[PDB]
CSV table of C-alpha atoms and ligand atoms in Angstrom, one decimal:
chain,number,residue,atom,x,y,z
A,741,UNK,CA,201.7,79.9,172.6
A,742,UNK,CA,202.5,81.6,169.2
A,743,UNK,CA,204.0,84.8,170.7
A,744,UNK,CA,206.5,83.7,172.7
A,745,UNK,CA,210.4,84.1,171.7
A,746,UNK,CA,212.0,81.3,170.9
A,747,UNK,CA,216.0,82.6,170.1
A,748,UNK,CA,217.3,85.7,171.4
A,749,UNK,CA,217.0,87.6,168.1
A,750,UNK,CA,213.3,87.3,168.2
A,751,UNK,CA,213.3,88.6,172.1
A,752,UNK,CA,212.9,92.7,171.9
A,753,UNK,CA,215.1,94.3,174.8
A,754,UNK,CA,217.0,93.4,177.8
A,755,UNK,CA,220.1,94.0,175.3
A,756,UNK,CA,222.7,93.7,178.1
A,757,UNK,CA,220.7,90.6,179.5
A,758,UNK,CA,220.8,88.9,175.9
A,759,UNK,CA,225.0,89.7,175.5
A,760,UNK,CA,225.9,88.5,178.5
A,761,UNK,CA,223.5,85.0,178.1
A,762,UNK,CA,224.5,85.2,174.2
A,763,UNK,CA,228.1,85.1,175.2
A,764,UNK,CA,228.1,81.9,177.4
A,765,UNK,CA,225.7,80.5,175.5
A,766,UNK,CA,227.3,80.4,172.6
A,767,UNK,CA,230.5,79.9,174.2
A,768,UNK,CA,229.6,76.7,176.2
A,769,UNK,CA,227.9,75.5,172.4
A,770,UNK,CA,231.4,76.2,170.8
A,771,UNK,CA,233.3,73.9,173.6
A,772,UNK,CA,230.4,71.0,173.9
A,773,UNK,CA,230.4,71.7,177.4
A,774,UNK,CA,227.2,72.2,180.0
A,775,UNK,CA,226.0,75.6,180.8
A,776,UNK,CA,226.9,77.2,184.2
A,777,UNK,CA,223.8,77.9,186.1
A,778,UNK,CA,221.6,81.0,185.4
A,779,UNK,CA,219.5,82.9,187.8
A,780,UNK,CA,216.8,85.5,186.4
A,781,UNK,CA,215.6,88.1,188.6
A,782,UNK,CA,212.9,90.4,188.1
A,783,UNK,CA,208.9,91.1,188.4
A,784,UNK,CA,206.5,89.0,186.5
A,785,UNK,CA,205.9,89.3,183.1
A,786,UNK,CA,209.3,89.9,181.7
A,787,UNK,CA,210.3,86.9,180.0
A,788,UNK,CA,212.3,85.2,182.5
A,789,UNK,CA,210.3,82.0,181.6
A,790,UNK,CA,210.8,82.8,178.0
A,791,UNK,CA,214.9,83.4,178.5
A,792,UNK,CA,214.5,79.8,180.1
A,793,UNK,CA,213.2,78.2,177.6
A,794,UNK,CA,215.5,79.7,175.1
A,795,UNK,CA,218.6,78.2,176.9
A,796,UNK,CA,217.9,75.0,176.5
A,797,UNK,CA,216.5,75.5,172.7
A,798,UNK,CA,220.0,76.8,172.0
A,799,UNK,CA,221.6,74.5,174.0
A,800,UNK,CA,219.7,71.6,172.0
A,801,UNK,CA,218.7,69.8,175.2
A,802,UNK,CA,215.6,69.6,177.0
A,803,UNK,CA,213.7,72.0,179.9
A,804,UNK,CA,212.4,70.2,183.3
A,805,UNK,CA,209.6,73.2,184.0
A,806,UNK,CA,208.9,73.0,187.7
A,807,UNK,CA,208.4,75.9,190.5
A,808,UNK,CA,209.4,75.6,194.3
A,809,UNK,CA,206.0,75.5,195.7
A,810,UNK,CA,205.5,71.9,193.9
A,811,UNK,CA,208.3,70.3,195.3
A,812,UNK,CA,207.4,69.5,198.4
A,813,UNK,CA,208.7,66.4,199.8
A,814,UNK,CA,212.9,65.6,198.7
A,815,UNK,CA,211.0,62.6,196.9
A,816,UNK,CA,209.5,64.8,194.1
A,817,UNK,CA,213.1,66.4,193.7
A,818,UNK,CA,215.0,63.1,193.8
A,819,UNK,CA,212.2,62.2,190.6
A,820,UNK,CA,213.8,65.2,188.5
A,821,UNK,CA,217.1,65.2,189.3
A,822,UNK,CA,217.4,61.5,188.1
A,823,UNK,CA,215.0,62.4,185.5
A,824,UNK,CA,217.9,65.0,184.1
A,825,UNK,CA,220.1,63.8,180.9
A,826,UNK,CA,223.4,65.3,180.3
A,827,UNK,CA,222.7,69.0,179.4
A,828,UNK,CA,219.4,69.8,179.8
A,829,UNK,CA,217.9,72.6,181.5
A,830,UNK,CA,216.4,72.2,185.2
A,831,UNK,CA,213.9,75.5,185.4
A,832,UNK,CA,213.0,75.9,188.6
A,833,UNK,CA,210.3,79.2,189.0
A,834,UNK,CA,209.4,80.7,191.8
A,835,UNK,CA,212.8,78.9,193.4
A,836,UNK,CA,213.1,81.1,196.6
A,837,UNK,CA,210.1,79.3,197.3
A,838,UNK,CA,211.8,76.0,197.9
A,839,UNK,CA,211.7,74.6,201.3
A,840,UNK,CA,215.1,73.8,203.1
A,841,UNK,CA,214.1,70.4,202.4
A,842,UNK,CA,214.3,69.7,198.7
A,843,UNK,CA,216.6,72.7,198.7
A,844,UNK,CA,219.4,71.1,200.4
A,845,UNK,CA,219.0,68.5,197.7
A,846,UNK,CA,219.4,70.6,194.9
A,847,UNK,CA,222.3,72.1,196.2
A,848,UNK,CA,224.0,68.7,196.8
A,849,UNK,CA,223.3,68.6,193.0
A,850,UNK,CA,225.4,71.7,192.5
A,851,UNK,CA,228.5,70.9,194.6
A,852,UNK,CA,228.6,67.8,193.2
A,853,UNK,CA,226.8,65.0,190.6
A,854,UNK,CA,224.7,62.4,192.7
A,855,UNK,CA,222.3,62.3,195.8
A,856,UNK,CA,224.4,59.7,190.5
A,857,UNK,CA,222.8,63.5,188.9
A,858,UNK,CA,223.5,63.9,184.9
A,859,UNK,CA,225.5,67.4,184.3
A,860,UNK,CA,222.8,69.7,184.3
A,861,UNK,CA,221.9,73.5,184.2
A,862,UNK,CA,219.9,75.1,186.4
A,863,UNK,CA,217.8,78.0,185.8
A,864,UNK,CA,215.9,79.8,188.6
A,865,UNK,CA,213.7,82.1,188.1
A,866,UNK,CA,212.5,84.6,191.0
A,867,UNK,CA,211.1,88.0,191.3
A,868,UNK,CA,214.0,89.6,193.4
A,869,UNK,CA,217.1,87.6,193.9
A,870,UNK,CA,217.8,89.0,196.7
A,871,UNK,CA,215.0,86.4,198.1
A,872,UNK,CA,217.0,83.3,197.7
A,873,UNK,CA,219.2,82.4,200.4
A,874,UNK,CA,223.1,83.1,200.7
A,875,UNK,CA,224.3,79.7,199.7
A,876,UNK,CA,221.7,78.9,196.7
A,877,UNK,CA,222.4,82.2,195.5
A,878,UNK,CA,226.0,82.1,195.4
A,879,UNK,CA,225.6,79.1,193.8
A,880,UNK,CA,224.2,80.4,190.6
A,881,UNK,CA,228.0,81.7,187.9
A,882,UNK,CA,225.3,83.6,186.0
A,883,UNK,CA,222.9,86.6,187.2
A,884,UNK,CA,220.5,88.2,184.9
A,885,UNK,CA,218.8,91.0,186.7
A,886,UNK,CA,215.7,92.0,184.7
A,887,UNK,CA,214.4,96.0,184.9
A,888,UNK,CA,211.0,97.2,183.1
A,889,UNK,CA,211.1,97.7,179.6
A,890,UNK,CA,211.4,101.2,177.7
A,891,UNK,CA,208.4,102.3,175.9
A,892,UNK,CA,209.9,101.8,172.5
A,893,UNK,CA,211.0,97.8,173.3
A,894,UNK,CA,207.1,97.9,174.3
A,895,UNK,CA,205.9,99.6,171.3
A,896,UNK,CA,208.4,96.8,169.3
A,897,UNK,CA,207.1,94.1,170.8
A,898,UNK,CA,203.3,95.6,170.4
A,899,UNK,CA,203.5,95.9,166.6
A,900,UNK,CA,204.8,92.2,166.5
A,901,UNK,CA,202.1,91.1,168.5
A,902,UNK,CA,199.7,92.7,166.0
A,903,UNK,CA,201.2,91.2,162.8
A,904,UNK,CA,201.2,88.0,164.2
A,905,UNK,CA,197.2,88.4,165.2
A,906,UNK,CA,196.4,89.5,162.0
A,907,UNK,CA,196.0,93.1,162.6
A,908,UNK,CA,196.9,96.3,161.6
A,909,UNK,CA,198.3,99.0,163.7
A,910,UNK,CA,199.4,103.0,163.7
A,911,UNK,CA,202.7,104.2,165.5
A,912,UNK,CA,200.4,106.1,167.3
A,913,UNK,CA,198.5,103.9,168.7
A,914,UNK,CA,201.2,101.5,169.6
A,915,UNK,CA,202.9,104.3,171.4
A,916,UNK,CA,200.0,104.7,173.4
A,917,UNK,CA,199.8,101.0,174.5
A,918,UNK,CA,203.2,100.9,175.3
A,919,UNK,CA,202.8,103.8,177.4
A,920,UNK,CA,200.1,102.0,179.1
A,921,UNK,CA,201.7,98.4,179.6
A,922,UNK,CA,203.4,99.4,182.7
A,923,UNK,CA,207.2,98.5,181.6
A,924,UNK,CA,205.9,94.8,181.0
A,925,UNK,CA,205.6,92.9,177.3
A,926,UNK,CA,202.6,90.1,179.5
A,927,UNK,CA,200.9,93.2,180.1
A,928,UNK,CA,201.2,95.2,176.5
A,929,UNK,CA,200.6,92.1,174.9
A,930,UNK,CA,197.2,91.4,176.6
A,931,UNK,CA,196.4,95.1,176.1
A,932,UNK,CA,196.9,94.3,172.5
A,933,UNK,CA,194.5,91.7,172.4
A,934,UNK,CA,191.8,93.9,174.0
A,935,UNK,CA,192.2,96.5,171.9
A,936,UNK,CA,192.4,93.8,168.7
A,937,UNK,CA,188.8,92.7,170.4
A,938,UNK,CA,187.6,96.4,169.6
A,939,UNK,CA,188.9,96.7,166.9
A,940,UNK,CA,186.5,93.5,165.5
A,941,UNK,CA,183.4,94.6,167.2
A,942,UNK,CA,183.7,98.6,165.6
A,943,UNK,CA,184.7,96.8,162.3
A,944,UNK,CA,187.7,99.2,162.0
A,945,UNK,CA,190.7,98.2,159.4
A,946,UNK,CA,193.1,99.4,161.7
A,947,UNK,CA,194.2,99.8,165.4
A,948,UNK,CA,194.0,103.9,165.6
A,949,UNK,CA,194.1,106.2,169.0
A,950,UNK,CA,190.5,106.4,169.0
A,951,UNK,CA,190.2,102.6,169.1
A,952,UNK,CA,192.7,102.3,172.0
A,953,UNK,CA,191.4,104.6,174.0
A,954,UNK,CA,188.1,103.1,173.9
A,955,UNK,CA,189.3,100.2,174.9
A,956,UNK,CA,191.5,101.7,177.8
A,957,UNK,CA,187.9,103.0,179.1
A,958,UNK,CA,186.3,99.7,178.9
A,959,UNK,CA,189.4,98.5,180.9
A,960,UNK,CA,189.2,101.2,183.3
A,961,UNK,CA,193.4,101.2,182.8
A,962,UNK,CA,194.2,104.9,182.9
A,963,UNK,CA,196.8,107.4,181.3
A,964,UNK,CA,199.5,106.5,183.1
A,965,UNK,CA,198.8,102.2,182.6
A,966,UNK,CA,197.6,102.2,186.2
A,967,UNK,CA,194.7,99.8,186.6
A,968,UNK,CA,191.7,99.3,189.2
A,969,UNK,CA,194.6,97.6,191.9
A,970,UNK,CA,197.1,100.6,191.3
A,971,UNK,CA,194.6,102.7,192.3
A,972,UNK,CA,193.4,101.1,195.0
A,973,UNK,CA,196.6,100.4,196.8
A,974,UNK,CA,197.3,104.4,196.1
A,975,UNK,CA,194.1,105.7,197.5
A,976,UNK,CA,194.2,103.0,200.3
A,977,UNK,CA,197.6,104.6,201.3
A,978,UNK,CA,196.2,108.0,200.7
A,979,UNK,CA,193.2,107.9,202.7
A,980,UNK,CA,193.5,105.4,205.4
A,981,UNK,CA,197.2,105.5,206.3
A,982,UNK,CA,197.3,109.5,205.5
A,983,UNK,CA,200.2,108.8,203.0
A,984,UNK,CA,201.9,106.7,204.5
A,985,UNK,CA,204.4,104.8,206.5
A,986,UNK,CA,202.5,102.3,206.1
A,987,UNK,CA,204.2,98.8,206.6
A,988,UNK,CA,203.8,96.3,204.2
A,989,UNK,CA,202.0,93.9,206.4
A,990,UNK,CA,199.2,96.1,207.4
A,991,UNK,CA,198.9,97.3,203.8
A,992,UNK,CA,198.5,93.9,202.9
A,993,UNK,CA,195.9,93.4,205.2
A,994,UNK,CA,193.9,96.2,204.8
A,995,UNK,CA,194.0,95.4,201.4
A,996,UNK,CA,192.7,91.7,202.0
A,997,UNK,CA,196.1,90.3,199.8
A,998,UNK,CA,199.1,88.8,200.5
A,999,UNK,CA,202.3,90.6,201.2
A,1000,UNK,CA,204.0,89.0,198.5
A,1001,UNK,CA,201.3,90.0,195.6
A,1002,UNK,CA,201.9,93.6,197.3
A,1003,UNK,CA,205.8,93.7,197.5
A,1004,UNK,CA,206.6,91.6,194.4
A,1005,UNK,CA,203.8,92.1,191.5
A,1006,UNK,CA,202.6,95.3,191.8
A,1007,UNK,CA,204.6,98.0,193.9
A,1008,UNK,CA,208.0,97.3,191.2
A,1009,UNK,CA,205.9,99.0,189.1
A,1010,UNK,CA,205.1,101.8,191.2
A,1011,UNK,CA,208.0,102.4,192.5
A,1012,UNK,CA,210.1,103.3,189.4
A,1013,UNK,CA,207.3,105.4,188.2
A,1014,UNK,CA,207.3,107.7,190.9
A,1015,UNK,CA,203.9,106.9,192.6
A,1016,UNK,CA,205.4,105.1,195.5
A,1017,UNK,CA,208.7,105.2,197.7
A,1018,UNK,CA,209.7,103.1,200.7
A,1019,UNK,CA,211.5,104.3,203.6
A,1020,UNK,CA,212.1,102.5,207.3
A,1021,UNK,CA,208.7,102.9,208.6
A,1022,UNK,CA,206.8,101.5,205.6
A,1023,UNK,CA,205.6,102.4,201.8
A,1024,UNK,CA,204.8,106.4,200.9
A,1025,UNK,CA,202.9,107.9,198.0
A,1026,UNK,CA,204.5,110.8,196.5
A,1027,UNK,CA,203.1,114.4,194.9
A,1028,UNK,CA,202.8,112.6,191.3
A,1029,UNK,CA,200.3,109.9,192.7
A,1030,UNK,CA,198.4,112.4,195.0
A,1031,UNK,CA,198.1,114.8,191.8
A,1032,UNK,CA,197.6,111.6,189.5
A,1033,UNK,CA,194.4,110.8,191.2
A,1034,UNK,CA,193.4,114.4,191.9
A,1035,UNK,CA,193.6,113.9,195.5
A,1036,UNK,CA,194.7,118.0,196.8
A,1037,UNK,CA,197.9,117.9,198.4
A,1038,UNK,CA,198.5,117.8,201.8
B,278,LIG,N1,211.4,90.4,175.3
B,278,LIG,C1,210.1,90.0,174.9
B,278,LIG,N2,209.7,90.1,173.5
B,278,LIG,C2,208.4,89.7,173.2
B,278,LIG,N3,207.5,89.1,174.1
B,278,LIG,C3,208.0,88.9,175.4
B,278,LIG,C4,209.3,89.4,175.9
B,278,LIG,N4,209.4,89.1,177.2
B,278,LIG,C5,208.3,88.6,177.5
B,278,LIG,N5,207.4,88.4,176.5
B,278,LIG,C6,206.2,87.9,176.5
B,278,LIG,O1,205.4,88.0,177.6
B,278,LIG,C7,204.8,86.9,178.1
B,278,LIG,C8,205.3,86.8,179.4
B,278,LIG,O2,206.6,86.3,179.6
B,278,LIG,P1,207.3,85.3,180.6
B,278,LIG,O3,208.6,84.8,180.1
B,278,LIG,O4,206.3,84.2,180.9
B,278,LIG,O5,207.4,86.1,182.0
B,278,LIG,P2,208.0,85.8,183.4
B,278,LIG,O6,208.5,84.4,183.5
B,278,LIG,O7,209.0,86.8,183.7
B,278,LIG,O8,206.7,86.0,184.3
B,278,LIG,C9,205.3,85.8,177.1
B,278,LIG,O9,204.1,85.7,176.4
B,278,LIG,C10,206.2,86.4,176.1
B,278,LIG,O10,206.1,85.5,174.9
């Protein structure tokens, strides 16, 4: 709980995310008037619930948290929306997700105040906004798209992680986390923890290269961040499909996951690093992945 952001000068990165929340924020503060809805778009880990909670801590109202798989039945969304006081923060996760059902509902919420609905802001959260439908989505005055993070936001939030723990750390060895957190402050900051956990049992006084590395073997996370999954969904591509196309479905499958896990949690990563591209008949490895894993090119 204790390394989460709660203001937008303690969140590292995303600077043209934070001006353009920062200025309606502040804005809609200034006039006493209710936040137009917000929609934050991006993979996992990135702090979309974190921006959420934010809003509403700046706003000085309260956060419903709630995902689209839970409401089911327009009953449970009925129970919120009356639940809502004047102001607060409706965060819906995972809000493509909600059925046409207690979508409909939610919507009537937006076009207008009752089913009477308190003046409310609604944040979605979603991993790709292009999943929610037309209407919802044009819905939402606010977008915040949400790309990886650079190694030195990483590295930033790394070394705060690490003060905060109680611990000690080099540049150098933050540097190589970051590199290994593949563009996500969930992932570096779990790293962080790992290596902290290593750093306890060799009764070191600080985190060092040497002490990260170790713990990167006992990890099995690799050079480039890539862990046992990476790997396996490269070498599946590689070996079974002969590099690809491969469609998504059948990946999925072969791979015994769903799509969605495939699509939206781990091939964003691997796309903008250069292991994986997607064309009309399916997913592709590239050169860089075949020569990552020593596979000889074909
Ligand atoms: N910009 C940031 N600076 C520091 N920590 C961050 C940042 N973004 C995310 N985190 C951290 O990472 C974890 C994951 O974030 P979260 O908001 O839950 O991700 P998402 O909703 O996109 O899956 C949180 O622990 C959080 O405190």
């Amino acid at each position: 709980q204790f390394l989460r952001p709660k203001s937008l000068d303690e969140f590292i990165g995303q600077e043209n995310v934070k001006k353009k929340l920062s200025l309606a924020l502040e804005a809609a503060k200034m006039r006493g008037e209710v936040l137009d809805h917000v929609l934050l778009a991006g993979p996992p880990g990135l702090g979309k619930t974190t921006l959420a909670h934010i809003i509403a801590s700046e706003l000085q109202t309260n956060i419903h948290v709630t995902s689209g798989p839970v409401l089911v039945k327009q009953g449970d969304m009925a129970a919120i929306l009356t639940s809502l006081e004047r102001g607060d923060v409706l965060f819906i996760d995972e809000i493509h997700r909600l059925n046409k059902a207690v979508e409909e509902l939610l919507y009537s919420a937006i076009e207008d105040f009752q089913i009477d609905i308190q003046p409310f802001t609604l944040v979605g959260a979603t991993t790709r906004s292009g999943l929610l439908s037309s209407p919802l989505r044009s819905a939402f005055g606010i977008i915040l798209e949400l790309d990886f993070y650079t190694v030195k936001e990483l590295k930033e939030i790394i070394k705060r992680a690490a003060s905060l723990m109680d611990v000690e750390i080099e540049d150098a060895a933050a540097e190589m986390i970051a590199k290994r957190s593949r563009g996500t402050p969930r992932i570096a900051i779990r790293l962080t923890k790992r290596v902290r956990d290593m750093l306890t049992v060799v009764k070191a006084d600080r985190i060092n290269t040497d002490i990260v590395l170790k713990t990167m073997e006992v990890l099995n996370i690799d050079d480039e961040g890539l862990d046992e999954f990476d790997r396996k969904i490269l070498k599946t591509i590689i070996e079974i499909y002969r590099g690809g196309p491969v469609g998504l479905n059948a990946l999925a499958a072969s791979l015994g996951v769903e799509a969605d896990t495939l699509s939206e949690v781990y091939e964003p990563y691997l796309l903008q690093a250069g292991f994986l591209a997607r064309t009309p008949r399916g997913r592709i490895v590239t050169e860089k992945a075949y020569k990552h894993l020593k596979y000889e090119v074909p």
